[PDB]
């Protein structure tokens, strides 16, 4: 409510660790938790996979 949770990747990113997600620019994400500020927990609408993503790499859509 009020807060937007659908995001789009602005750049390509390759997971560095076992916890983070890799993605293509243009890939959409449902955000599961954004309370930490640097790393957000999310789900890829493309693979159905779950994991962390850098918040500075994605932008709000719709």
């Amino acid at each position: 409510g009020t807060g937007v949770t659908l995001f789009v990747a602005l750049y390509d990113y390759e997971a560095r660790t076992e916890d983070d997600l890799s993605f293509h620019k243009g890939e959409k994400f449902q955000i599961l938790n954004s309370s930490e500020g640097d790393w957000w927990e999310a789900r890829s609408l493309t693979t159905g996979e779950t994991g962390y993503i850098p918040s500075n790499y994605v932008a709000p859509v719709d």
Binding site: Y11, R16, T17, D19, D38, P54, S55, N56
Partner: peptide
């Protein structure tokens, strides 16, 4: 949350 810093934006 990985912490090892998100790399700066391009």
């Amino acid at each position: 949350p990985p912490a090892y810093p998100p790399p700066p934006v391009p």
